[PDB]
Design a protein around this ligand. Structure first.
Ligand SMILES: N[C@@H](CCC(=O)O)C(=O)O
Ligand code: NA
Ligand code: NA
Ligand code: NA
Ligand code: NA
Ligand code: NA
Ligand code: NA
Ligand code: NA
Ligand code: NA
Ligand code: NA
Ligand code: NA
Ligand SMILES: [Zn+2]
Length: 867
């Protein structure tokens, strides 16, 4: 069952493989793989070649065409001894795509065959040096039944093709860029193809090809459009062009993650490709955009420069997430992007950094590498890259990117290499900054202020510390870029300065405790603190309600207005959760409701921003405010708050809802912002007088000319338990049952229902005609949404949620351990809950620990959780 691997153990490989020639005789039941690799020894003469392989049937081994006798198979490996220094290795083996339920390696997605090799899936295809610092030039020949698999795709360009007897054919591909094997891809199947072209700024014409299941071609143009937008943006912002002749994307229905950046042949979860205005929401459109961009941006940050080892995952993922965010932000509402990314950081990643699974963005220890494709590596990773950007500014940051590619193009690099490039290009010292790579947990930054009217000085006294996490007992101060702005009482910025000279508004918070003194502060300021969430930290500062509403009215950056609103609410969320636990109803000062009233009626606020201020923090974001989480109190308080605001703001809500009506549906940023505001008003309106609400919601649902508006109405019906809910839910089922992606939204609504009988409805749905345990998207929509997005039901006092999740994980552990491990995450958070909950959650985890054939993926999490 073991065994953890450790970053500090990295060693350069004893052998390299420079070129690999693959042939697949493809069949669902039995695929024959022939792999001819050119190998070179780099380590000691007597070192055996250790190849990784899993679930392979070895047929033969030859070395320079000599059948080899000096080898043995061991657990996960083929160990070949007594080799020359350079030689040709030839392996023949068999695998069975149809048996592959874990969806790693070569597997079946409906009638298609496709691959997923990151992290360590290639070893499920043949015996190989399945480690990302081994880089080979691939040539791939695919042979298959012509009728079942008319399209035979791999990385690169087509260099040969032929027909064979018995209705077979083949295509051979060649990719000139050396690659680690996690970037190998193969697809075989029968597809509709949308083809288009992008012309790079230096005049290279790239053929673009999007492969979708037959009948899905009508849902492809947005994705193709987003790809072109991605290519253009990476040229304009980063100076990067695509480096091949063709760019293929294949949308498949059975896929564990969102998508995969395989060189020239990305494979996508169809969730992040398929859109039409009646099937997909504005959010889907902007997610498709994000993820198409992300995989495209990987071509440089990931493919042209790869990872020395898997502990360096954030080198590509943090950076590529930063890039997808800058892309979304440049194209759309930068404020909305930042706000949402901050909501994700505070509401979801902070929770992980306080969990038993906590790790630094560059982990030190890993048992199952698929457990480290995390909010931390990705989202916190990007926040770290963004801190570098904050510290260097754009021009220097882009010089660091240039030095990074100039030094590392065509190699496997480390996080440390990236930091060094940024430091050397910029001349900004990032020694201390590197500690963000090696330390887990969320720093807490404590600020106290003092204004001195005699000296006309404002002084901030800033402290930091990070609590211990289960993985690390010593913690040390980080280099926290801590952006401020100071406002006079009319809302003007006060120049920051000291002893005659300008001071940078990004303060360098590097120690446990420091003081910063600003001079020439003629009037007592109101500060904005941690502007743009300039570091991924908790901020402890004793805001007055009035300072916060002042900021809501006057802060220069849209984000600071939002964030001031969140700090205003936070006090009253905490108040009312304590009240709720004593049986006391919601209490909200009049002046708080008035601050949201003012936002509804301020004509000068960008509606994109108004919408976000009028979107209350989620139950996950609310949970981050507390030492011990009470999910039932949080959920009832969020409901009560919503009903309070609905009552107090009813007329203003209706007015803004009506004013933002749009007869034309467009996927355009201004339109989206208006719709988002409209629908934010709708959420409150749904909790007004019952009949009025029922009529308004039902009308939106029935008269919508797009899925954004239909879903928002259905969601509101569900959330407020309106009388129309059952009829609208049944209508959506009747209309959409045949469409998995669209039914996923309905599964989410079912799983997150506040109805008393939600669990029972969810169990029933395991037999629904649109549900299947074979499909990860369906799993995550129904089961995962219950456990992870309905904490109130998941954490029902009778413990029924935990038992339900145990039953589901008991199946998934064997079927698909990666989706199992995603779904176990809520149970591993047990120590945030009260003792009675902890006790039932430990018991659920102890049941799981006892499973016959416990996957490594779950073993890792369960062990940390029970510690
Ligand atoms: N492969 C990623 C998603 C997309 C990406 O990181 O490139 C994951 O498995 O979570
Ligand atoms: Na071959
Ligand atoms: Na073996
Ligand atoms: Na990836
Ligand atoms: Na990559
Ligand atoms: Na923008
Ligand atoms: Na595994
Ligand atoms: Na994976
Ligand atoms: Na809000
Ligand atoms: Na949380
Ligand atoms: Na906008
Ligand atoms: Zn990625």
């Amino acid at each position: 069952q073991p065994q953890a691997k450790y970053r500090h153990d990295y060693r350069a490989p004893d052998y390299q493989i420079t070129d690999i020639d693959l042939t697949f005789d493809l069949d669902a039941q039995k695929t024959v793989v022939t792999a001819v690799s050119q190998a070179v020894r780099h380590g000691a003469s007597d070192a055996p070649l250790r190849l990784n392989g899993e679930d392979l049937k070895l047929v033969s081994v030859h070395i320079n065409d000599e059948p080899w006798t000096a080898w043995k198979e061991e657990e996960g490996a083929l160990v070949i001894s007594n080799l020359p220094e350079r030689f040709t290795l030839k392996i023949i083996n068999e695998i069975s795509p149809a048996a592959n339920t874990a969806l790693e390696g070569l597997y079946q997605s409906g009638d298609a065959l496709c691959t997923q090799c990151e992290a360590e899936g290639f070893r499920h295809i043949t015996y190989y040096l399945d480690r990302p610092d081994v880089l080979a030039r691939f040539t791939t020949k695919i042979i298959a039944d012509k009728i079942k698999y008319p399209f035979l795709l791999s990385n690169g360009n087509r260099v040969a093709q032929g027909e064979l007897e018995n209705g077979r054919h083949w295509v051979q591909w060649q990719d000139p860029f050396p690659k680690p094997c996690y970037l190998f891809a193969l697809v075989a199947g029968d597809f509709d193809v949308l083809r288009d072209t992008f012309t790079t700024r230096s005049g290279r014409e790239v053929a673009l090809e999007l492969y979708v299941d037959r009948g899905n071609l009508d849902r492809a143009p947005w994705a193709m459009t987003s790809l072109k937008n991605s290519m253009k943006w990476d040229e304009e912002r980063f100076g990067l062009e695509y480096d091949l002749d063709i760019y293929m994307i294949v949308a498949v229905d059975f896929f564990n993650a969102g998508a995969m950046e395989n060189k020239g042949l990305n494979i996508f979860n169809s969730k992040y490709v398929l859109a039409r205005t009646d099937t997909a929401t504005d959010k889907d459109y902007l997610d498709i955009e994000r993820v198409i961009g992300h995989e495209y941006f990987h071509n440089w940050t990931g493919n042209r420069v790869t990872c020395r080892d898997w502990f360096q995952l954030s080198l590509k993922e943090g950076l590529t997430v930063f890039r997808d965010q800058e892309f979304s932000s440049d194209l759309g509402s930068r404020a909305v992007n930042r706000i949402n990314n901050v909501r994700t950081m505070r509401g979801l990643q902070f929770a992980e950094d306080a969990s038993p699974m906590a790790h630094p963005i560059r982990p030190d220890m890993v048992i199952e590498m698929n457990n480290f494709y995390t909010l931390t590596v990705y989202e916190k990773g990007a926040e770290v890259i963004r801190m570098i950007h904050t510290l260097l500014g754009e021009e220097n940051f882009q010089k660091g990117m240039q030095l990074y590619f100039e030094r590392h193009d065509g190699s496997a690099a480390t996080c440390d290499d990236f930091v060094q490039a940024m430091e050397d290009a910029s001349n900004v010292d990032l020694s201390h900054f590197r500690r963000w790579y090696s330390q887990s947990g969320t720093p807490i930054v404590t600020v106290k202020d003092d204004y001195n009217p005699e000296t006309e000085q404002y002084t901030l006294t800033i402290s930091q510390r990070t609590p211990a996490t289960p993985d690390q007992a010593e913690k040390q101060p980080l280099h926290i870029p801590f952006a401020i702005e100071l406002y006079d009482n009319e809302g003007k910025v006060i120049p920051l300065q000291k002893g005659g000279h300008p001071v940078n508004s990004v303060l360098n918070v590097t120690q446990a405790e420091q003081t910063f003194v600003f001079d020439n502060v003629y009037f007592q300021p109101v500060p904005a603190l941690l502007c743009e969430f300039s570091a991924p930290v908790k901020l402890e500062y004793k805001w007055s309600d009035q300072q916060l509403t002042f900021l809501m009215r006057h802060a220069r950056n849209d984000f600071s207005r939002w964030d001031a609103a969140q700090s205003l609410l936070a006090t009253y969320i905490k108040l009312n959760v304590a009240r709720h636990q004593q049986g006391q109803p919601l209490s909200l000062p009049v002046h708080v409701a008035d601050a949201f009233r003012a936002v509804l009626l301020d004509e000068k606020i960008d509606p994109a921003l108004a919408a976000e201020i009028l979107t209350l923090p989620s139950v996950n974001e609310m949970a981050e405010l507390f030492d011990i989480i009470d999910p039932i109190a949080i959920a009832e308080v969020r409901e009560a708050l919503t009903r309070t605001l609905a009552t107090e703001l009813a007329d203003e809500l209706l007015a803004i809802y009506n004013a933002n009506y749009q007869s034309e549906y467009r996927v355009e940023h201004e339109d989206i912002a208006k719709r988002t505001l409209r629908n934010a008003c709708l959420r409150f309106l749904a909790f007004g007088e019952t009949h009025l609400a029922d009529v308004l919601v039902s009308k939106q649902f029935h008269e919508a000319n797009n899925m954004t508006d239909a879903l928002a109405a259905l969601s509101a019906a569900v959330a407020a338990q309106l009388p129309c809910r059952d009829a609208l839910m049944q209508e959506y089922d009747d209309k959409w049952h045949q469409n998995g992606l669209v039914m996923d939204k309905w599964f989410i609504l079912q799983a997150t229902s506040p109805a008393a009988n939600v669990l029972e409805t969810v169990r029933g749905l395991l037999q629904h005609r649109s549900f299947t345990m074979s499909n990860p998207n369906r799993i995550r929509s129904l089961i995962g949404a219950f456990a992870g997005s309905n904490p109130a039901a998941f954490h029902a006092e009778d413990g029924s949620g935990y038992l339900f999740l145990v039953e589901m994980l008991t199946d998934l552990n064997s079927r698909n351990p990666q989706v199992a491990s995603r779904l176990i995450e809520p149970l591993i958070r047990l120590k945030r809950y009260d003792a009675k909950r902890q006790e039932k959650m430990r018991a659920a985890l102890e049941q799981l620990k006892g499973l016959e054939n416990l996957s490594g993926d779950l073993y890792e999490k369960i062990t940390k959780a029970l510690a």
